[PDB]
């Protein structure tokens, strides 16, 4: 049955009904057979023609395995009040206000039964936990603060699956040298300079608004770096004054383990001349002959269904 409280502001009043789901909205909270914004986002994300790069590389069963790790991060210590359904015997008026209850145990069971076709659908279902807490307990209750942090963890984990599902699973399991594991579409290796930090080796995971999502060898920290401050990996080092030599040496050692792993899996790794700029979705390091780019990639391909 249809909800009585607006999905945006969590208050009652004259509200519009979605044709596909039980959510309701004030016309003014959206600034104008109707399908709500949650249903529109999910439909686009689950259509093969408009699905994300992460969804193109995953089956529904594979996505269910990654959502189980996201549930573990959402179940932080102190989230006890949201780990099981609200006991109606202990709050006898709960169902007079909450028509669509949700909790972390129910969210975990729906993920296991392969109910979710995209990351957007898991976050949209998780959000009933916060919406219900605000209606019943109030916007300034101690439990509402806990529910807001649970939703922010869920948002972060969905964003991490979408950046690269293989990096996500490697970071979850933490095998020895997990950061040196190459992905099926290998991330280019760069020298990256962040303002105020020395030039350092990093993996380039994404390109957005003239920036590169860099993941640094050694500490495994991350930052958006300007594209003009990124060069393809080279033997000559762009020198920077550094506080501790041994930390730089460990990062370079870990970087050389990643390069040998790449050469075993794909059969090639091309270092570039000094100060060669990084370009979006660079293919230079995988070329069969770096002086003949028209010849293309070295990857032979054996029609492998390998993935899991
Ligand atoms: Zn509203
Ligand atoms: Zn809807
Ligand atoms: Zn990756």
UniProtKB/Swiss-Prot annotation:
Changing residue 137 to A: Decreases interaction with histone H4ac. Changing residue 4 to D: Increases interaction with histone H3K4me0. Residues 186-236 form the PWWP domain. Residues 1-177 are annotated as: Interaction with histone H3K4me0. Residues 54-161 form the Bromo domain. Expressed in neurons (at protein level). Absent in astrocytes (at protein level). Expressed in all tissues examined with highest expression in brain, lung, pancreas, and placenta. Expressed in cutaneous T-cell lymphomas (CTCL). Changing residue 216 to L: Found in a patient with syndromic intellectual disability; uncertain significance; disrupts interaction with DBN1. Residues 3-236 are annotated as: Required for interaction with histone H3 and histone H4. Changing residue 200 to R: Found in a patient with syndromic intellectual disability; uncertain significance; disrupts interaction with DBN1. Induction: Induced by all-trans-retinoic acid (ATRA) (at protein level). Residues 1-308 are annotated as: Interaction with histone H3K14ac. A zinc finger (PHD-type) spans 3-42. Zn(2+) 3 binds at residues 164, 167, 183. It is found in: Nucleus; Chromosome; Cytoplasm. Zn(2+) 2 binds at residues 18, 21, 36, 39. Chromatin reader that recognizes dual histone modifications such as histone H3.1 dimethylated at 'Lys-36' and histone H4 acetylated at 'Lys-16' (H3.1K36me2-H4K16ac) and histone H3 methylated at 'Lys-4' and histone H4 acetylated at 'Lys-14' (H3K4me1-H3K14ac). May act as a transcriptional corepressor for KDM5D by recognizing the dual histone signature H3K4me1-H3K14ac. May also act as a transcriptional corepressor for KDM5C and EZH2. Monomer and homodimer. Interacts with NuRD subcomplexes containing GATAD2A. Interacts with the histone deacetylase NuRD complex subunit CHD4; the interaction is direct, appears to occur with monomeric ZMYND8, and is increased following DNA damage. Interacts (via N-terminus) with the P-TEFb complex subunit CCNT1 (via central region); the interaction is direct and the association appears to occur between homodimeric ZMYND8 and the activated form of the P-TEFb complex. Interacts (via N-terminus) with DBN1 (via ADF-H domain); the interaction leads to sequestering of ZMYND8 in the cytoplasm. It is linked to Mutations in ZMYND8 may be the cause of syndromic intellectual disability with variable cardiovascular, ophthalmologic and minor skeletal anomalies. This is MYND-type zinc finger-containing chromatin reader ZMYND8. It comes from Homo sapiens.
